[PDB]
Design a protein around this ligand. Sequence first.
Ligand code: HDD
Ligand code: HDD
Ligand code: HDD
Lengths: 309, 83, 727, 727
Amino acid sequence: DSLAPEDGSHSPAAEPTPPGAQPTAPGSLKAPDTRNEKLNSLEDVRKGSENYALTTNQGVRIADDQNSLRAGDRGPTLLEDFILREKITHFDHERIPERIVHARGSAAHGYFQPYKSLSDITKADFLSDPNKITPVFVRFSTVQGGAGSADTVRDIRGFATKFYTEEGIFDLVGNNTPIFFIQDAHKFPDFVHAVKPEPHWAIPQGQSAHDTFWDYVSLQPETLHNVMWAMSDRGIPRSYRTMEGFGIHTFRLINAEGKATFVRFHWKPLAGKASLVWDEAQKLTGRDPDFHRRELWEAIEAGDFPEYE
Amino acid sequence: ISRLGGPNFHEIPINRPTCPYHNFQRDGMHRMGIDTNPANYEPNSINDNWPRETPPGPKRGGFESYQERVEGNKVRERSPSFG
Amino acid sequence: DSLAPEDGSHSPAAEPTPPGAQPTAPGSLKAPDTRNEKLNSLEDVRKGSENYALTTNQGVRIADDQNSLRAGDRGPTLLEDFILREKITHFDHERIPERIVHARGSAAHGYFQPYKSLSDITKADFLSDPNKITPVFVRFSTVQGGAGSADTVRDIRGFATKFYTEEGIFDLVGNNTPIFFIQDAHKFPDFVHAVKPEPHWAIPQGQSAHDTFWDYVSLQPETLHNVMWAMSDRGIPRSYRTMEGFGIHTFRLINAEGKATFVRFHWKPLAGKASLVWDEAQKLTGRDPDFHRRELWEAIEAGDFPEYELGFQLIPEEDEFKFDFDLLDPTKLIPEELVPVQRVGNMVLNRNPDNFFAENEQAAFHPGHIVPGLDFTNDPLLQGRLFSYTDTQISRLGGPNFHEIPINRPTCPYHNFQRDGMHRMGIDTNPANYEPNSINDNWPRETPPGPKRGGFESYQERVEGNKVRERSPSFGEYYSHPRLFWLSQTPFEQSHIVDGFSFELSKVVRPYIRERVVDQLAHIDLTLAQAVAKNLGIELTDDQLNITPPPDVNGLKKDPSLSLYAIPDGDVKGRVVAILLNDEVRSADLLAILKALKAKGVHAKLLYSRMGEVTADDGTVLPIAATFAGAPSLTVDAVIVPCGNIADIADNGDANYYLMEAYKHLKPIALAGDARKFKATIKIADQGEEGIVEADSADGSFMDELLTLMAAHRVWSRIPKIDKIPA
Amino acid sequence: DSLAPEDGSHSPAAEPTPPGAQPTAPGSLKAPDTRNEKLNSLEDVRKGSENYALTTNQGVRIADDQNSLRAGDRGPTLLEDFILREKITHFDHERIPERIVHARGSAAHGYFQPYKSLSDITKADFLSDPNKITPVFVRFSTVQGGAGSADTVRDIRGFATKFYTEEGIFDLVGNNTPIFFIQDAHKFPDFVHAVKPEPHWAIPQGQSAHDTFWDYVSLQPETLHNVMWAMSDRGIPRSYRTMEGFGIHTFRLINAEGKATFVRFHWKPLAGKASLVWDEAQKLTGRDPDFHRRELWEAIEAGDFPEYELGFQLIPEEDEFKFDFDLLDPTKLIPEELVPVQRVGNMVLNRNPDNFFAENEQAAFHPGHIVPGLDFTNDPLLQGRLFSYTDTQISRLGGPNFHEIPINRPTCPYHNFQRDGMHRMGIDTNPANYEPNSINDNWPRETPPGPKRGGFESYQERVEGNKVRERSPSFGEYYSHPRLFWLSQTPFEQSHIVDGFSFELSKVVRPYIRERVVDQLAHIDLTLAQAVAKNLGIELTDDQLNITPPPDVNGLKKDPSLSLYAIPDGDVKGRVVAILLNDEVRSADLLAILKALKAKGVHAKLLYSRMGEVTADDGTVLPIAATFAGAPSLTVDAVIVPCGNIADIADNGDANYYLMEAYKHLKPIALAGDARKFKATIKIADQGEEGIVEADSADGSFMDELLTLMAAHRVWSRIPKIDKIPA
Ligand code: HDD
Ligand code: HDD
Ligand code: HDD
């Protein structure tokens, strides 16, 4: 009953390997020895597969997963085939709405550690002890395109970090430029509608290069600063590893004595800052629309972990 | 699908089997189970075809319908015996 | 308060205009006088905008749509700002789930009209009289990629038509190849999961070129027939206008006397069959991921309406078992040499939607939506489809009232005892919500079946057998149809199939999967298998070289109707030519070029190294449509270079590459006067070659030769020359 | 194929008819001539039924709606039965989430008209012209129970009015008491969770009589004021027609000069104030859980329209701080003795919906739906309400397009740049979906504020303070308003409050909670506290007996407007009388009875020991409406027994109990001729007593005396006599 090759060449080595040397794999199979508190806490919902019987969602073993139940082997399919209907029902409802913005994104697990206690300026527990390790989950993204759009478009990039701290989840939801296009949230649907595919025909995907975007820009000069960044090579990063991150807004740090300090957040890439050039980026959306997602996944599989200060 | 919000209603705790369940179904709203199978289809070679079908048998076998004989034309008709 | 330009140049003309001549627009503003019964019935939900106040959804006029309400102009935003919250709430919930498959699609309104009454073979009302005009809504699609994926991927294409008939909605939900990959609907999630992005990392988008797809194929030889089609140039159509459509399954036509005839449905494109080549298609997903969506919309705005002839392959009930294959097997085609396609009517797509989301995204097609005069068969793929297309709408469209979404509404009457459900629009006045009832005199009432305006009754097919989960043995043949397809292609089409398999298998990381697929190809044709094997560094064994080929299909050595190009059918109307300008164009050349193109309905785009204008030798001001890089040769069907100051562009890398890319992609190229110096960049000798038009000046003969080349689509004889071209 | 009776008795007459005379029907079939702008605007979604074929939702006629498609008439059902699957799918998804609170409610259409222009104090367009008619849709409700819970529970009632104005929808979302239980919206889930069924076992339905509610009350004295109202007979109204309505919060009116006036909204019932008594209300939840829904629908079918006068309490901005309590505290009422209610206009409810689910269940009211001329205040309960009523519709009504559900649609224009979302009905043609735009000349456009037809601008209230989660100290007083309410009630109303607390606390299992509530009552009034304590077997301590009462409210020791009954306001129109028949009724009695009731708009129910008919002494055939047990005295306002063959019913247990129950519940009873023998059943002396009408015959003053009793609602003087009745 074995369909795997006898030489075992179907299974990727569970050790760091360079891009293309092995098939890519789920993280807990590729790197079983990598752990953190969050990864450990997900074990209760991880599901295996090897050596298990194929079942319905109700736990009933399936004998023939190749055929519908019919009245004769050339007959009509019967309504009483609950195995078919459960399998097709689940398939029929697989999709959930994509994010309104930043629908295209690539994510990884990791950890954060502060260099020293910041208790003089903030009572935040995750910043209180250099030995305190906080698990993170990070998602990098474009802004305009759908979940099935291309990576190397000209766009702003999102850089969202979920810190699983001992005193609650802290999400630092930033972008790869230090400002945004607009001043007041009331205008967000206007700006986003202008940059998104135009409503009559739903064109263009992953591009601000169309009338409605530049119409809005020309009528809203507050947008010009972030437009400058988007039109620069900042808009076409070489990799999620080679871009900066910013929280954009001024927030506050609050210490134990009640003192507030204004703060803006920054991520500094250990790999440095690097971008493509336009002709390359555009052609690459055709040759490999998954280039950034792939590069992130493969760097981690190689042990070449993305790092950000 | 409407009452419980989608196709993962078997993951709501009261509905969960206490016996094993494994298959190639994926995703859907409020998906709890995180599948590690490299494959989400069968037949597959990349996971040596697991999880695997099980032939019917006296115990722990796969489900097979009783091979009742069906004979008749396709009709929307009540059986006279019900009348 | 007016932000529009004083000259009115913001507003597109409400008249047919060629691609790029005007901004595109909602269909009811571009073509307000194009009407049909369905389009007219949508007027109750169309919303205008001009001269109206900006309001909340509750009708309250907004005074300041630029600012949130705050405590001081530098203060915190207040929870009482209901205008902000309503606007952001609506934004926050704009997205609905995309279709599980065929998420990427482009749609248009049109109409269908039969050529004659089909009453002798079907009682379907929409086919009963050549005077019956039926509105349609058609959505073309890819299969694998998301709604935001690219158009010109290698994939099967969907071709779904909603017929708004006087006796109900009929949805013909087909594809652009005559078979499907699998035999039984129970396997659909397996096949789709295998072709879709792999579940760990969600790669690759819009591509079958990955391990899991070819793993499934190698283990399920039933897939090989449709795989052959996908690896051919059928997988990369030039336009939705230049592909065929097929219902795939055998259905039944039922006439008034109750006689059943088996039928397979066909759409024949008036524009002919035409496809890209792989390198062009792949690069075009980067240069313009919206290319097919754009070309469909712009053809309709130009008056180049997509047209498709509906055809039926008809097989009497008594002939069910007269072929080498099972009629109910959706992995088998019916060769036109054995059963001709009888043309029965024509469909014209003549208006774009107003709002993509409301009309395209929310449209629900389902092959179970049939009408009296049609019926199903036991095809086990069709049988399971019947369950899926109603089920899936409960999440995708939010509940069981999806038929009340305007695009989905029948134009004929509908009345029943169904009630409630999320977003219920219809307010029922019937005292009864059940039947039988006396309190409403049993209305609405059942209708017996009959020749016209009768109730639906299934054809009383005899069913005999035991309840089994079992594939019919008649379905267990996998190689003869792939071989018939292979043998029916031209030599260059065969080369492109080889290159398709070779490219895709090269992207499979696990080598044994490649080897298993090559072994399957050896069961189809050894020339195909050896050619793919050579490109993969695989050597066939002596055992593989001795595999007996499968038998012919009912005596057929080939069927040229399976080739895109063996029988010429192309027409140039609606195609487009790039014209590469210089700063002092020979106006006489351009006059003759544009006159000849206009006479044939071929569009032109004037390209230069910058935007703005250039002035011809006689003072004619020429407006520039795009730069060489902004509208690459990928987006056109041919390239013409008129004479003038050729020195202006002779050393321009983009201009030289424009011709090299077009040359590599087998497109016609025409060079007038000093533009013939560009022959050096494409390595064409002074004596010239077939496929490169050249003359001292552009003229009638010059343009006749180019338009003849365009009618043949591509210059296949150039293929031996392109491998040395660095492009 | 017609199942209706040949005599047409299945169809109710489309004319006003009294309760029970005809089957009830959808409003547009019962009263097609009753129209308003909103009702007319719904015609595009109303669906008929008569003379139409039964179809699928796709418009396909159904031939056999009695059977599934099967392989043989005794065979398995086939998956290809799309008619079955569509019908069952729709059934399977009929239900939507019920409202979090106020899930049980009953609704009607109507209209509002102001008495005079209020332009001096508000620019609200619907209040600008006495000739301007504003359509309304009103939903009355309970609070705690589910959509399937009973009407006549002890609870607060909701009173929600949707005004379809020319300048937007205004929703006045009020209750039947002038205060709420809590001060800050942050506590709303705590309070509601405490009153709702307890989470382990989901008991009790429709009742605050359980530990968690009284636990919360005992720990949150701010609740005591509205608790007092709920424990009074206010908690058990006779009908939605006989209760007051209140907006509770202080809002603002804004005039064209920008001047703000504080306002509290009031509804005054034309039918007067009237409530049940507890034993009656509780038993009625069993005998007819739909009593209030039924009475509302049947009053409208009878042409006896519920009417309510809108009134305003108006407080100038400079008087904000001149009261002992904070105007922004929703646990405090504004006594009418301090600020009179000024009459504003009248609302008439004159047509029932067609489909309860489509119009009632799907209606969305929200107090943030205001119009120019109105504004909010910093009331911290109102402030949080503004968030909830938009948010909750995303799940309840399936997404952000809930304003497109027909009942919710404005009748005035609504245009904006919002797009998409689930169930999107409107098809936007605007080239732009953003502003500012030039491509549509910036339409739809913002509108500056102005005297009429202007944009919404918030009143520029001064805000000064630090960001704090802190209750205003001015809110920290909890007992003076409960005491004012207590002191304003009649002695019998006070007894009913004592009995309400006593009964509810008896259902609290943990005795310490009862003791803690009694301690709170001792801070309100020691007479109340002692009487409740006595009924609970609790002895007040000396310390409790020495608690100083809270101060008067701005010098008031009572305000009679807080009593249901202190100032008579009852009108008998729309009430109902049970008439207990015998097998040979004295027809002269019955003629005098029925005609006197009819002249005052009082309905009658002819009751007997069986259904069918009886014949009077003169041969008149009398149709029986219900049996004694089938329409118990709980469902009527008074009981009349005419003379005749009294021996027929004298020993009937149900007939005797009918009188005992009505007697216990303080209802007027009238006995003519030999019917006076029933005085022995209710233990009434030969000389008679006030509240029992008796005479030799029903002529003379008999009916006037009974109608006078009915105008006073109940016979409160009878209370000492019922306290030992075995009934
Ligand atoms: C008021 C609306 C609004 C405004 C003004 C912004 N966003 Fe946002 N953003 C959203 C509304 C939103 C959202 C609709 O809530 C999203 C989409 C789906 C989601 O979960 O959140 C989102 C997603 C989203 C993501 C993706 C998170 C993920 O990976 O899942 C990022 C990185 C940002 N945003 C970052 C920003 C930045 C840097 C902004 C400017 C400083 C910004 N957003 C303004
Ligand atoms: C049992 C499952 C199943 C099977 C075996 C098939 N499909 Fe399908 N198809 C669906 C389940 C489905 C679906 C999940 O129900 C979709 C996705 C969203 C939808 O509305 O229907 C769909 C969408 C869909 C569309 C897009 C319609 C649109 O534009 O909205 C087309 C053209 C087809 N299919 C065509 C086919 C063809 C030609 C098939 C083989 C003969 C086929 N499908 C087999
Ligand atoms: C912050 C939460 C919150 C608070 C403090 C209140 N409510 Fe509320 N109310 C809701 C949250 C809510 C809600 C959850 O949003 C409901 C349930 C379903 C709905 O549409 O709105 C609702 C329904 C609802 C209804 C039923 C409307 C209908 O018939 O559909 C009425 C009459 C009221 N409420 C009245 C009030 C009054 C008079 C309050 C105190 C002055 C009050 N509510 C406080």
